[PDB]
Amino acid sequence: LTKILQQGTEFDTLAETVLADRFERLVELVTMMGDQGELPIAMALANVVPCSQWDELARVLVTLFDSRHLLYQLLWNMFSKEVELADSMQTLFRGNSLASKIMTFCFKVYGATYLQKLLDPLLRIVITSSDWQHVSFEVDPTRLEPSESLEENQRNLLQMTEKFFHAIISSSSEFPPQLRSVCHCLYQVVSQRFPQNSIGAVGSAMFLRFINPAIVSPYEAGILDKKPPPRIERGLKLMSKILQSIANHVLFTKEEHMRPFNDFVKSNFDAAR
């Protein structure tokens, strides 16, 4: 079967070659990109497609332009639309739109290996060491049981935050090149959009759609094969919230128990930047 399978292009049918040529011509038909302007097929499909197919469209688009090595320009056009369609710096790309679906699929297909390799040792510390420690993670005074201590939970949660954050800052050197290209493509158009915290919105989206979803749901990511204990789950949700507040360059307001953590959040602004 191997030697049959690699036989060549002389044994295939006329129907097969005509079908292949017609498919290739259709693929080229999309990938024609005119000078000084965005690619026409993508602009049509961005504004025509019903919502129920939107993510599916994103998927095939990510499968296409990357295999033609043109993924950078596709992302350029999509973000170039999204920067003027969205006004507020907080509301940029957070809502359900095609830019969100495309960058979410890009994170899922590219950074899975990097995210898993970064995340599993900080997981394994919790799996064994802090588990027999059984350090509690309740910081809400109303949700706190009387037996537990507020300050000890806060200190454990704090130490866990610096461990995770410093692990990411250490792994700053390690990214796949495609993900870095995606971040660069986002950053350039965002800097065109505003001169204030162009890097900051990049960081907020970066923690928003890639980092924090794995932290809240490690089992759903497939990094951890088992469902963790619920105290650890609550703590990991708190990790995601605090790191998101770091990325947003703003401190907690409603949670009084997060107010001491605001100093550590604002302390790490420049390192994260």
Binding site: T113, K117, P176, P177
Partner: protein, 81 residues
């Protein structure tokens, strides 16, 4: 060094090392680097490198690496070079 099984196992070790060296996304090598590694894998597949590794007369190293399931030649340092 050693019997036929360990020498064949060493050859399989070298081949698997290069094979996993090119086929992994962790290292994210360049394309030309992958080309020269692909060339190196082919040149280690050659019978000349069988005779360098001390395995002679054996068609497939992978077959006799597991042959129990289913020292006479001297060693020269130029082959090691």
């Amino acid at each position: 060094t050693g019997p036929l099984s360990l020498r064949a196992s060493t050859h399989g070790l070298v081949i698997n090392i290069i094979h996993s060296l090119c086929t992994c996304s962790q290292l994210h090598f360049s394309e030309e680097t992958k080309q020269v590694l692909r060339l190196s894998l082919t040149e280690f597949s050659l019978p000349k490198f069988y005779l360098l590794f001390g395995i002679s007369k054996v068609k497939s190293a992978a077959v006799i690496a597991f042959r129990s399931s289913y020292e006479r030649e001297t060693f020269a340092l130029t082959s090691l070079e």
